[PDB]
Amino acid sequence: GLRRAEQNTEDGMSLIQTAEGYLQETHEIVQRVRVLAVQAANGIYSEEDRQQIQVE
Amino acid sequence: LMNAYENTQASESRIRDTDMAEQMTSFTRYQILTQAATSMLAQANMKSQSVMR
Amino acid sequence: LMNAYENTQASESRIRDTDMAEQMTSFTRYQILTQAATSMLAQANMKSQSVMR
Amino acid sequence: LMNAYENTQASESRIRDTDMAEQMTSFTRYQILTQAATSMLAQANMKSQSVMR
């Protein structure tokens, strides 16, 4: 059981390790929206250019 | 996908792949126990010759 | 095929091939019994002369 | 859990596993006692033959 308990504990971390791996890609996306929001907030763009920002 | 490829491959290895070092200890234990049991059986066969005198 | 070749050979051996360790006990058993039969046979031959006195 | 398994395995090892070197001492003592008793058993049978003269 203790040997069984140990093997589960690695498997528990593998599940935990993977979900954090998926959150890694999610976080990099939200920052990319954030930087594009800075450029989109500048005053020298027109409706067409900010719409192209909204496309991405 | 690469991260999940890493994390899942590690997940299966800890279930399917053996411990080479940990198994050598059990491998030697059974190799020793085999020789001990082999000799005791050889002792046991000759045990019955005592009454032949 | 090879996995099938192995399992067939393993399963065939259990019926055809003998256990040398297990066979030695039987071989030892009957060889001692051979001497006990040989010993008491000579006692039986000697049994008759006790009345020749 | 690795710590727990290591200590527990030794906990059970001391309880169940035999002392291989110490048990050879006991085995060799009972082996000779068997030889000694057997030879005296041969003597006890021949002892009764005395008064046939």
mmCIF file of C-alpha atoms in Angstrom:
data_model
loop_
_atom_site.group_PDB
_atom_site.id
_atom_site.type_symbol
_atom_site.label_atom_id
_atom_site.label_comp_id
_atom_site.label_asym_id
_atom_site.label_seq_id
_atom_site.Cartn_x
_atom_site.Cartn_y
_atom_site.Cartn_z
ATOM 1 C CA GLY A 1 0.000 0.000 0.000
ATOM 2 C CA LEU A 2 2.816 2.421 0.803
ATOM 3 C CA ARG A 3 4.458 1.330 -2.447
ATOM 4 C CA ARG A 4 1.038 1.758 -4.065
ATOM 5 C CA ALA A 5 0.613 5.102 -2.299
ATOM 6 C CA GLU A 6 3.910 6.326 -3.752
ATOM 7 C CA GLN A 7 3.009 5.399 -7.341
ATOM 8 C CA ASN A 8 -0.289 7.283 -7.113
ATOM 9 C CA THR A 9 1.541 10.341 -5.768
ATOM 10 C CA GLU A 10 3.656 10.610 -8.918
ATOM 11 C CA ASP A 11 0.499 10.167 -10.999
ATOM 12 C CA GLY A 12 -1.175 12.899 -8.972
ATOM 13 C CA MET A 13 1.675 15.280 -9.751
ATOM 14 C CA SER A 14 1.579 14.345 -13.445
ATOM 15 C CA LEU A 15 -2.056 15.457 -13.577
ATOM 16 C CA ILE A 16 -1.130 18.639 -11.701
ATOM 17 C CA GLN A 17 1.944 19.180 -13.874
ATOM 18 C CA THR A 18 -0.115 18.920 -17.072
ATOM 19 C CA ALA A 19 -2.907 21.332 -16.138
ATOM 20 C CA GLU A 20 -0.247 23.930 -15.324
ATOM 21 C CA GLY A 21 1.289 23.172 -18.717
ATOM 22 C CA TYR A 22 -2.003 24.052 -20.397
ATOM 23 C CA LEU A 23 -2.290 27.213 -18.301
ATOM 24 C CA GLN A 24 1.119 28.173 -19.708
ATOM 25 C CA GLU A 25 -0.264 28.512 -23.238
ATOM 26 C CA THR A 26 -3.374 30.277 -21.919
ATOM 27 C CA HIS A 27 -1.312 32.891 -20.070
ATOM 28 C CA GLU A 28 0.856 33.679 -23.103
ATOM 29 C CA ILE A 29 -2.310 34.335 -25.116
ATOM 30 C CA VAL A 30 -3.821 36.784 -22.625
ATOM 31 C CA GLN A 31 -0.638 38.863 -22.585
ATOM 32 C CA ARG A 32 -0.690 38.993 -26.389
ATOM 33 C CA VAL A 33 -4.191 40.463 -26.201
ATOM 34 C CA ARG A 34 -2.908 42.888 -23.563
ATOM 35 C CA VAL A 35 -0.066 44.295 -25.675
ATOM 36 C CA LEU A 36 -2.344 44.579 -28.714
ATOM 37 C CA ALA A 37 -4.748 46.512 -26.487
ATOM 38 C CA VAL A 38 -2.007 49.078 -25.813
ATOM 39 C CA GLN A 39 -1.413 49.637 -29.529
ATOM 40 C CA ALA A 40 -5.172 49.646 -30.137
ATOM 41 C CA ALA A 41 -5.567 52.336 -27.464
ATOM 42 C CA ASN A 42 -3.321 54.807 -29.302
ATOM 43 C CA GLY A 43 -5.012 57.700 -31.059
ATOM 44 C CA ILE A 44 -3.459 57.512 -34.529
ATOM 45 C CA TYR A 45 -5.468 54.534 -35.801
ATOM 46 C CA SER A 46 -8.726 54.528 -37.771
ATOM 47 C CA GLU A 47 -11.698 52.166 -37.595
ATOM 48 C CA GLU A 48 -10.231 49.876 -40.264
ATOM 49 C CA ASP A 49 -6.920 49.304 -38.462
ATOM 50 C CA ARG A 50 -8.468 48.639 -35.049
ATOM 51 C CA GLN A 51 -10.875 46.220 -36.737
ATOM 52 C CA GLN A 52 -7.849 44.300 -38.009
ATOM 53 C CA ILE A 53 -6.656 44.253 -34.401
ATOM 54 C CA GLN A 54 -10.071 42.904 -33.388
ATOM 55 C CA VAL A 55 -9.641 40.142 -35.979
ATOM 56 C CA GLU A 56 -6.642 38.681 -34.163
ATOM 57 C CA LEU B 1 0.766 19.966 -27.013
ATOM 58 C CA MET B 2 4.503 19.490 -26.439
ATOM 59 C CA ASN B 3 4.047 20.184 -22.729
ATOM 60 C CA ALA B 4 1.186 17.680 -22.553
ATOM 61 C CA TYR B 5 3.281 15.263 -24.607
ATOM 62 C CA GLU B 6 5.979 15.607 -21.938
ATOM 63 C CA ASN B 7 3.673 15.382 -18.919
ATOM 64 C CA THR B 8 1.670 12.411 -20.220
ATOM 65 C CA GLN B 9 4.764 10.491 -21.351
ATOM 66 C CA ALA B 10 6.170 10.971 -17.858
ATOM 67 C CA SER B 11 2.817 9.837 -16.458
ATOM 68 C CA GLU B 12 2.854 6.521 -18.328
ATOM 69 C CA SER B 13 6.536 5.830 -17.660
ATOM 70 C CA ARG B 14 5.994 6.009 -13.898
ATOM 71 C CA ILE B 15 3.258 3.387 -14.401
ATOM 72 C CA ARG B 16 4.656 1.141 -17.146
ATOM 73 C CA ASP B 17 8.456 1.524 -17.070
ATOM 74 C CA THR B 18 10.369 -0.484 -14.474
ATOM 75 C CA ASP B 19 12.992 0.641 -11.984
ATOM 76 C CA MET B 20 16.195 -0.961 -13.255
ATOM 77 C CA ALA B 21 18.058 -0.385 -9.990
ATOM 78 C CA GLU B 22 15.167 -1.458 -7.765
ATOM 79 C CA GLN B 23 14.621 -4.629 -9.790
ATOM 80 C CA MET B 24 18.275 -5.718 -9.573
ATOM 81 C CA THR B 25 17.821 -5.959 -5.801
ATOM 82 C CA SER B 26 14.853 -8.308 -6.182
ATOM 83 C CA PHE B 27 16.639 -10.089 -9.028
ATOM 84 C CA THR B 28 19.585 -10.887 -6.759
ATOM 85 C CA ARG B 29 17.324 -11.877 -3.859
ATOM 86 C CA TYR B 30 15.641 -14.560 -5.979
ATOM 87 C CA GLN B 31 18.958 -15.677 -7.458
ATOM 88 C CA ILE B 32 20.317 -16.152 -3.929
ATOM 89 C CA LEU B 33 17.139 -17.812 -2.650
ATOM 90 C CA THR B 34 17.256 -20.217 -5.589
ATOM 91 C CA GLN B 35 20.748 -21.391 -4.625
ATOM 92 C CA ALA B 36 19.790 -21.774 -0.964
ATOM 93 C CA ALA B 37 16.709 -23.833 -1.837
ATOM 94 C CA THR B 38 18.705 -25.814 -4.401
ATOM 95 C CA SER B 39 21.232 -26.928 -1.784
ATOM 96 C CA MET B 40 18.653 -27.726 0.895
ATOM 97 C CA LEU B 41 16.852 -30.030 -1.536
ATOM 98 C CA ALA B 42 20.202 -31.696 -2.256
ATOM 99 C CA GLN B 43 20.654 -32.077 1.504
ATOM 100 C CA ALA B 44 17.108 -33.431 1.799
ATOM 101 C CA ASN B 45 17.636 -36.148 -0.816
ATOM 102 C CA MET B 46 20.670 -37.530 1.044
ATOM 103 C CA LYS B 47 18.826 -37.252 4.370
ATOM 104 C CA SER B 48 17.196 -40.651 3.845
ATOM 105 C CA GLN B 49 20.466 -42.591 3.485
ATOM 106 C CA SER B 50 20.926 -42.448 7.272
ATOM 107 C CA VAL B 51 18.706 -45.491 7.885
ATOM 108 C CA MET B 52 20.461 -47.574 5.219
ATOM 109 C CA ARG B 53 23.052 -48.526 7.846
ATOM 110 C CA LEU C 1 4.084 -15.235 -34.437
ATOM 111 C CA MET C 2 7.084 -15.080 -32.095
ATOM 112 C CA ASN C 3 4.847 -14.395 -29.105
ATOM 113 C CA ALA C 4 2.799 -17.381 -30.283
ATOM 114 C CA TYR C 5 5.986 -19.396 -30.810
ATOM 115 C CA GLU C 6 7.075 -18.719 -27.221
ATOM 116 C CA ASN C 7 3.747 -19.565 -25.585
ATOM 117 C CA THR C 8 3.454 -22.814 -27.545
ATOM 118 C CA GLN C 9 6.963 -23.910 -26.544
ATOM 119 C CA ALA C 10 6.353 -23.002 -22.903
ATOM 120 C CA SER C 11 2.995 -24.791 -22.856
ATOM 121 C CA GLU C 12 4.430 -27.819 -24.653
ATOM 122 C CA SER C 13 7.302 -28.146 -22.187
ATOM 123 C CA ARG C 14 5.018 -28.368 -19.148
ATOM 124 C CA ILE C 15 3.584 -31.607 -20.563
ATOM 125 C CA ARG C 16 6.638 -33.158 -22.234
ATOM 126 C CA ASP C 17 9.654 -32.052 -20.179
ATOM 127 C CA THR C 18 10.400 -33.386 -16.703
ATOM 128 C CA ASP C 19 11.414 -31.598 -13.516
ATOM 129 C CA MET C 20 14.953 -32.776 -12.773
ATOM 130 C CA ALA C 21 14.790 -31.609 -9.160
ATOM 131 C CA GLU C 22 11.435 -33.345 -8.702
ATOM 132 C CA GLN C 23 12.570 -36.478 -10.523
ATOM 133 C CA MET C 24 15.687 -36.874 -8.358
ATOM 134 C CA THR C 25 13.577 -37.335 -5.230
ATOM 135 C CA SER C 26 11.737 -40.211 -6.903
ATOM 136 C CA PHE C 27 15.000 -41.623 -8.265
ATOM 137 C CA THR C 28 16.557 -41.377 -4.802
ATOM 138 C CA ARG C 29 13.453 -42.937 -3.252
ATOM 139 C CA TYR C 30 13.420 -46.079 -5.392
ATOM 140 C CA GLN C 31 17.192 -46.575 -5.195
ATOM 141 C CA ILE C 32 17.044 -46.803 -1.403
ATOM 142 C CA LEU C 33 14.035 -49.120 -1.702
ATOM 143 C CA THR C 34 16.098 -51.237 -4.088
ATOM 144 C CA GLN C 35 18.630 -51.889 -1.320
ATOM 145 C CA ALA C 36 15.959 -52.583 1.301
ATOM 146 C CA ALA C 37 14.446 -55.190 -1.020
ATOM 147 C CA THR C 38 17.943 -56.537 -1.679
ATOM 148 C CA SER C 39 18.784 -56.616 2.035
ATOM 149 C CA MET C 40 15.670 -58.433 3.225
ATOM 150 C CA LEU C 41 15.899 -60.911 0.354
ATOM 151 C CA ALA C 42 19.219 -62.121 1.766
ATOM 152 C CA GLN C 43 17.586 -62.322 5.198
ATOM 153 C CA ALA C 44 14.868 -64.502 3.652
ATOM 154 C CA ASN C 45 17.428 -66.879 2.128
ATOM 155 C CA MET C 46 19.083 -67.178 5.547
ATOM 156 C CA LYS C 47 15.722 -67.864 7.214
ATOM 157 C CA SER C 48 15.637 -71.529 6.199
ATOM 158 C CA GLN C 49 18.827 -72.754 7.893
ATOM 159 C CA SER C 50 17.567 -71.927 11.400
ATOM 160 C CA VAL C 51 15.679 -75.246 11.403
ATOM 161 C CA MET C 52 18.535 -77.340 9.990
ATOM 162 C CA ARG C 53 19.887 -77.605 13.548
ATOM 163 C CA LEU D 1 6.380 7.338 1.511
ATOM 164 C CA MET D 2 9.796 6.242 0.257
ATOM 165 C CA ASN D 3 11.060 6.744 3.811
ATOM 166 C CA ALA D 4 8.066 4.877 5.241
ATOM 167 C CA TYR D 5 8.453 1.930 2.863
ATOM 168 C CA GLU D 6 12.182 1.628 3.594
ATOM 169 C CA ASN D 7 11.750 1.518 7.374
ATOM 170 C CA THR D 8 8.668 -0.724 7.192
ATOM 171 C CA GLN D 9 10.338 -3.230 4.864
ATOM 172 C CA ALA D 10 13.173 -3.610 7.375
ATOM 173 C CA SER D 11 10.561 -3.778 10.138
ATOM 174 C CA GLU D 12 9.008 -6.829 8.473
ATOM 175 C CA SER D 13 12.378 -8.193 7.341
ATOM 176 C CA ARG D 14 13.515 -8.634 10.953
ATOM 177 C CA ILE D 15 10.232 -10.357 11.867
ATOM 178 C CA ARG D 16 9.869 -12.893 9.039
ATOM 179 C CA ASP D 17 13.220 -13.414 7.280
ATOM 180 C CA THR D 18 15.529 -16.021 8.769
ATOM 181 C CA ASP D 19 19.197 -15.626 9.668
ATOM 182 C CA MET D 20 20.934 -17.562 6.904
ATOM 183 C CA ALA D 21 24.262 -17.881 8.726
ATOM 184 C CA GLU D 22 22.759 -18.680 12.130
ATOM 185 C CA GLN D 23 20.348 -21.265 10.718
ATOM 186 C CA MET D 24 23.285 -23.140 9.191
ATOM 187 C CA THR D 25 24.553 -23.560 12.747
ATOM 188 C CA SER D 26 21.299 -25.222 13.808
ATOM 189 C CA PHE D 27 21.167 -27.365 10.664
ATOM 190 C CA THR D 28 24.675 -28.754 11.179
ATOM 191 C CA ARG D 29 23.965 -29.583 14.829
ATOM 192 C CA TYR D 30 20.793 -31.565 14.092
ATOM 193 C CA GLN D 31 22.506 -33.305 11.186
ATOM 194 C CA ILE D 32 25.193 -34.762 13.474
ATOM 195 C CA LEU D 33 22.705 -35.631 16.224
ATOM 196 C CA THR D 34 20.807 -37.620 13.599
ATOM 197 C CA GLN D 35 24.012 -39.477 12.723
ATOM 198 C CA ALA D 36 24.769 -40.099 16.399
ATOM 199 C CA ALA D 37 21.295 -41.433 17.192
ATOM 200 C CA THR D 38 21.249 -43.615 14.083
ATOM 201 C CA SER D 39 24.549 -45.302 14.960
ATOM 202 C CA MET D 40 23.289 -45.957 18.484
ATOM 203 C CA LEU D 41 20.121 -47.405 16.961
ATOM 204 C CA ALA D 42 22.307 -49.883 15.096
ATOM 205 C CA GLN D 43 23.985 -50.685 18.417
ATOM 206 C CA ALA D 44 20.724 -51.309 20.275
ATOM 207 C CA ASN D 45 19.635 -53.950 17.748
ATOM 208 C CA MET D 46 22.917 -55.869 17.994
ATOM 209 C CA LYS D 47 22.848 -55.640 21.796
ATOM 210 C CA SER D 48 20.112 -58.262 22.132
ATOM 211 C CA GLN D 49 22.148 -60.814 20.160
ATOM 212 C CA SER D 50 24.458 -61.348 23.145
ATOM 213 C CA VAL D 51 22.439 -63.889 25.131
ATOM 214 C CA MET D 52 22.005 -66.269 22.211
ATOM 215 C CA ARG D 53 25.247 -67.922 23.348
#
